[PDB]
Structure formats: C-alpha cells, structure tokens
Design a protein around this ligand. Structure first.
Ligand code: ANN
Length: 168
C-alpha cells in the first residue's frame, strides 16, 4: 500500500525519515524494501541482519537459494527477491565497501538499481560497515535516483546532520 507518513521532502523524488526501516516496512507495506546487502547475501548485521531477523530467516533461506544459482553478486549489483512479511519485493543492493578498497564511484551503480522500481523504502547505501560517508551517499542517491525514494535513517544524530547538510 506504500502508506509512507512523516517523511521530510529533500527533493521532488527523495524523502527522509528518522526511523527503523524494519518498523517502517511493517507500517508502510511498501512494494519494495531495499536491503544493504553484501555479495554473498549473508544478512549478518546492520540493516540486512535487521530485515532478515524481522522475516525470522525466511530472507536468508531465499537468498541462499538465489546465490546457489547465481554465485555472488557484483559490487554495484542487485537482485529482486521476495519481501516476505516486510514488502512485496526486497531489492538486495550491494554498495562498495570502501574499507576493502572498493571504489566509491560504484555507489552510483548501486543507486542506479533503484530506477527499476517506481517507489522504494531504502537505507543509505555503503554507510556503516562499508565505510562511505553517509552524507556523500545521500548526495549520490539524490543525483542518481529518479524514482520515488523514502530513506529511513535509524540514528537521530546522523539524521539531523543529513537534513542540516541538505537544507542549511
Ligand atoms: C506488506 O508488503 C507488501 C506490499 C505490497 C504488496 C502488493 O502490492 O502485492 C504485498 C506485500
């Protein structure tokens, strides 16, 4: 039903909220939730681990089946799998891990996957353990994505920095 509420307009197609993306997915029933994935679709921590836990491991079993046919995803790549109880679809997207020397330029590729979907509930890509500056990631999202993105940011201090950078 894509019942988004309380999202702050950044641009005509990019919205942001200080929220837990799992709790958003349950309230919003989005067509697409984006997972911040790794190439093996192993949902061991961060957003991935949270989404998977909220599916009680349904997401991990399906992800394994996919990886059995595909092998690992490419950096900047994606796959569309079931959203289970969280969403119709989960778009698993792999941003570059800059800690492992993956090039930050691949972040554009990663966000370009969002343009295959009219409306998404998403995290910021390559944040947290993949080591990209989250405000940089937001700029790449705004520059790259032309479909309607609803970004959930868990941490209030980071949320305020993002909104301050964008609007002040
Ligand atoms: C709860 O997540 C969803 C959202 C949309 C749909 C649908 O439109 O079919 C199904 C499940």
């Amino acid at each position: 039903v894509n019942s988004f509420s309380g999202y702050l307009k950044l641009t005509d197609n990019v919205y942001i909220k200080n929220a837990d993306i799992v709790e958003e997915a349950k309230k919003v029933k989005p067509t697409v939730v984006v997972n911040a994935a790794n190439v093996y679709l192993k949902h061991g921590g961060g957003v991935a681990g949270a989404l998977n836990k909220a599916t009680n491991n349904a997401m991990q079993v399906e992800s394994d089946d996919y990886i059995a046919t595909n092998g690992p995803l490419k950096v900047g790549g994606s796959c569309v799998l079931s959203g289970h109880n969280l969403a119709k679809h989960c778009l698993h997207v792999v941003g570059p891990n800059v800690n492992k020397g993956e090039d930050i330029q691949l972040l554009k590729s990663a966000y370009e996957n969002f343009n295959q979907h009219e409306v998404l509930l998403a995290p910021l890509l390559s944040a947290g353990i993949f080591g990209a500056d989250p405000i940089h990631s937001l700029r790449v999202c705004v520059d790259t994505v032309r479909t309607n993105v609803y970004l959930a940011v868990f941490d209030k201090n980071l949320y305020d920095k993002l909104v301050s950078s964008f609007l002040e």
